[PDB]
Single-chain antibody, 459 residues
């Protein structure tokens, strides 16, 4: 029927920015949409996340640096201080009337990439360290030289016992004391450790083993030029004389996942560790580390660091040791978005020839699916969001985009909490990632699935 033809355009379509910059992006509607305007953030490979609805109202869990205003035809989104998390593509969406419409999007590029951090922390950094300490009262000194690739999370060290040779305890208890600057950090997680330099940082650690042996270590990490310098203090006591440590029955650390979190203004790490033993058992240990940058740096959100550490070679007494570590940071949970606790997973994407048919379906969980209206939104490769179809909570009244009207059919089964999209007479332009999303009365789509991909191709 006769409907309004609301064109949403955003400006700029792309810009380059730096962390700390204030960014404002705007959008214009071809006709009045009152204040029924929402904003979405889309990071590469992920589903759009709802930031703002009704032009100014922040979605739950959105940091306060995001704001919005406007009523009528012209609206703005503002980020007061751009953070690494914020570099995404941003879309606006009108909800004054069907068909719903998105803007073309605004892409936020990182200006000059990481050229600033790579001037401080070089792509290769050498290591010089000295460790002094005691285990069960046995004093020793170890020195080390090495080299690593801080942006790839890898490093290698050559260690030589200078005092206290031969060590009477398992060398494996020392190796995690021999620098998180050697961690691969993805672009959207603030890197606490690299940002700490050239001044550096320090860490304190406790290691509580399951037979009540306890180690305490500290390390002060500085840099000049292309070389890190560590000053390490290591102490351990109460290792039983027939335990795996004093009997040297450990083989290697198992790979681990350290949980990083912020507390008392610094970064803390907790990791459950396990030594493999001769004979096949394990020897367990809880690590608790406090990391302290020597200057104000940007604190990160909770995340995880995966570790693998191994002795590549050694002499009989471990007077000479070559030591390797690989470390990489990531978020834990595992493309979909939400603002509460409900999940959507789409399925049914695949390859069809032109004119073929495909049936998509989404599963809902963690809510009352029959209580909300549902939408399909698609995104062609390289293109922006496009609203496809909508269905009321009971399923009686449905709406469609003109581009699919007559070939697509939306439906739902509320007892199974699933939503369907039946696609007939598929065209090349129908090929896209198809998202399922929940529509709220405020006009925003607050929960999205990861999408499923439709491909339309012939011989």
């Amino acid at each position: 029927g006769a409907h309004a033809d609301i064109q949403m355009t955003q400006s700029p379509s792309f810009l380059s920015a730096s962390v700390g910059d204030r960014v404002t992006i705007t959008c214009r509607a071809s006709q009045g949409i009152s204040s029924w305007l929402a904003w979405y953030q889309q990071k590469p490979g992920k589903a759009p996340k709802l930031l703002i609805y009704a032009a100014s109202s922040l979605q739950s869990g959105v940091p306060s640096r995001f704001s919005g205003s406007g009523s009528g035809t012209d609206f703005t989104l503002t980020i007061s201080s751009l953070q690494p998390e914020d570099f995404a593509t941003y879309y606006c969406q009108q909800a004054n009337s069907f068909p719903l419409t998105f803007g073309g999007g605004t892409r936020l590029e990182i200006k000059s990439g990481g050229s600033t951090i790579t001037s401080v922390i070089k792509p290769e950094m050498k290591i010089k360290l000295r460790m002094e300490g005691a285990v069960n009262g046995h004093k020793f000194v170890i020195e080390g030289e090495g080299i690593g690739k801080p942006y790839e999370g890898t490093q290698t060290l050559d260690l030589t016992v200078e005092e206290g040779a031969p060590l009477p305890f398992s060398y494996d208890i020392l190796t995690p004391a021999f620098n998180r600057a050697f961690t691969k950090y993805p672009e959207d997680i603030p890197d606490y450790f690299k940002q700490a330099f050239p001044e550096g940082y320090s860490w304190e650690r406790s290691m509580t083993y399951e037979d009540q042996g306890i180690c305490i270590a500290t390390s002060d990490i500085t840099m000049e030029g292309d070389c890190f310098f560590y000053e390490i203090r290591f102490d351990g006591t109460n290792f039983p004389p027939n335990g795996p440590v004093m009997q040297k029955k450990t083989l290697k650390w198992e790979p681990s996942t350290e949980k990083m979190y912020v507390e008392d203004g610094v970064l803390k790490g907790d990791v459950e560790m396990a030594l493999l033993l001769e004979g096949g058992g394990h020897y367990r240990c809880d690590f608790k580390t406090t990391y302290k940058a020597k200057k104000d740096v940007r604190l990160p959100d909770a995340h995880e660091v995966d570790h693998r550490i191994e002795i590549l070679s050694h002499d009989k007494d471990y007077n000479k040791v070559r030591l390797y570590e690989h470390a990489e940071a990531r978020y834990s949970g595992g493309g979909s978005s939400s603002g509460t606790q409900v999940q959507l997973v789409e399925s049914g994407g695949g390859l069809v020839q032109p004119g073929g048919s495909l049936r998509l379906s989404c599963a809902a969980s963690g809510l009352t699916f029959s209580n909300y209206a549902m939408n399909w939104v698609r995104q062609a490769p390289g293109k922006g969001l496009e609203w496809v179809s909508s269905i009321s909570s009971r399923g009686d009244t449905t709406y469609y985009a003109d581009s699919v009207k007559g070939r697509f059919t939306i439906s739902r089964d509320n007892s199974k909490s699933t939503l369907y999209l039946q696609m007939n007479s598929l065209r090349a332009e129908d090929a896209a990632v198809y998202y399922c999303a929940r529509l709220r009365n405020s006009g925003g789509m607050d929960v999205w699935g990861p999408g499923t991909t439709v491909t339309v191709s012939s011989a």
